[PDB]
Amino acid sequence: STGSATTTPIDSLDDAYITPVQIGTPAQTLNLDFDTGSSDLWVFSSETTASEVDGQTIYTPSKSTTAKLLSGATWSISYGDGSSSSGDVYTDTVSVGGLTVTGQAVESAKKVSSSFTEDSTIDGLLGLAFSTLNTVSPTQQKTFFDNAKASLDSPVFTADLGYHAPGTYNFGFIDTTAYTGSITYTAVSTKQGFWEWTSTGYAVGSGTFKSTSIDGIADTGTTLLYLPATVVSAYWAQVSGAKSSSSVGGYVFPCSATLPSFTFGVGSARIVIPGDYIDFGPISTGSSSCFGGIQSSAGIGINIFGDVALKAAFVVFNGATTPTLGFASK
Structure with a gap:
C-alpha cells in the first residue's frame, strides 16, 4: 500500500503545514499538523473544553461507528515551545492520502493550551517520531506510520514541504x-x-x-x-x-x-x-x-x-x- 496527501501552509509565513486526515466511519476530515518531532496523534474533539475551542473542526467519536474507547487510557503532552494538551483515547480507522490504518489510537483532547485554541487552522497533530515517545498511559500506543509500516510497499515516508506553497507527504514510496x-x-x-x-x-x-x-x-x-x-x-x-x-x-x-x-x-x-x-x-x-x-x-x-x-x-x-x-x- 501507499498514501499521498497534500500539505498546505496555514498562513503566509509558513508557520506550520496542515494535511487532511480522515478519521472514523463515516469519515470525519480534520486538518492535522504532521510532526516528525512527536509521537501522538491527537485531535480537537467533542470532549474538548468548550471555551478552548475556537473555530477548529472537531472529532466526535460518538458519530463514528468504528470508534471504541480505549478503556483507562489517558495522555498528556508538553511541547518544546510550552504548548500542551491532554485527554483520553479512542481507537478508530484513520486514513491519510488513501492509506488506511485500522485500530489507530486517536487521542481526544479534553484540554488544550491557549496557543492551540488561538489557532483555528490546526485541528490536532499527527506524530511521526518514534513510538517510544508516545505519551499514552498505561499502555503506550503506536504512531500512524508504525501501524502502517508492515503494509507499505517500502517502510518509508517522505516530506516535501513548499515555500509559500503546498507540498506533499507520501507514505510507502519515493x-x-x-x-x-x-x-x-x-x-x-x-x-x-x-x-x-x-x-x-x-x-x-x-x-x-x-x-x-x-x-x-x-x-x-x-x-x-x-x-x-x-x-x-x-x-x-x-x-x-x-x-x-x-x-x-x-x-x-x-x-x-x-x-x-x-x-x-x-x-x-x-x-x-x-x-x-x-x-x-x-x-x-x-x-x-x-x-x-x-x-x-x-x-x-x-x-x-x-x-x-x-x-x-x-x-x-x-x-x-x-x-x-x-x-x-x-
Whole structure:
C-alpha cells in the first residue's frame, strides 16, 4: 500500500503545514499538523473544553461507528515551545492520502493550551517520531506510520514541504520525479525517540563551507531552524543591522534587508536554504523589524532542523530496521 496527501501552509509565513486526515466511519476530515518531532496523534474533539475551542473542526467519536474507547487510557503532552494538551483515547480507522490504518489510537483532547485554541487552522497533530515517545498511559500506543509500516510497499515516508506553497507527504514510496539529482542518506540515532542525525557543516551565503558536526533532529512540526549560537551568530553577522533581541525572543533584522542563503551539509552533499526562506516578517503588524528564521538552540538542549531547513529539500524518513534519513535538492 501507499498514501499521498497534500500539505498546505496555514498562513503566509509558513508557520506550520496542515494535511487532511480522515478519521472514523463515516469519515470525519480534520486538518492535522504532521510532526516528525512527536509521537501522538491527537485531535480537537467533542470532549474538548468548550471555551478552548475556537473555530477548529472537531472529532466526535460518538458519530463514528468504528470508534471504541480505549478503556483507562489517558495522555498528556508538553511541547518544546510550552504548548500542551491532554485527554483520553479512542481507537478508530484513520486514513491519510488513501492509506488506511485500522485500530489507530486517536487521542481526544479534553484540554488544550491557549496557543492551540488561538489557532483555528490546526485541528490536532499527527506524530511521526518514534513510538517510544508516545505519551499514552498505561499502555503506550503506536504512531500512524508504525501501524502502517508492515503494509507499505517500502517502510518509508517522505516530506516535501513548499515555500509559500503546498507540498506533499507520501507514505510507502519515493517519488523520483519530486527531486533533482540524487538522495544522500545519513545515519539516524533513535536513542532520544527523534529522527536525530548529524549534519556535516554549513556555509553562509557565498562563503566557504565550514566542516563541523552538528547533531540535530529533522522536525516538520517546528517552524524555524535552531542551531548552535556560534553558527547563528556567523549567519546574522552577514546582515546589516541584525541583532539578538531579548525582548522579542531572538534574532531580528531590518525588513529592508536582503538575506543571504544558508547551506547545510548532508554527508558530502549540500542543501541550500534561500535567503527568502529565512524571513518571518514583521515582529508586529507594521513594524520594520523582521523576525529571523534561523535562531539559537542554546537553552533548548537540541538543534532542530525545522521547516525552514526541511522545505529546502526532499526528505526521506526511512523506517527500515535501521532507520536513516535522506535529503535531496529539489
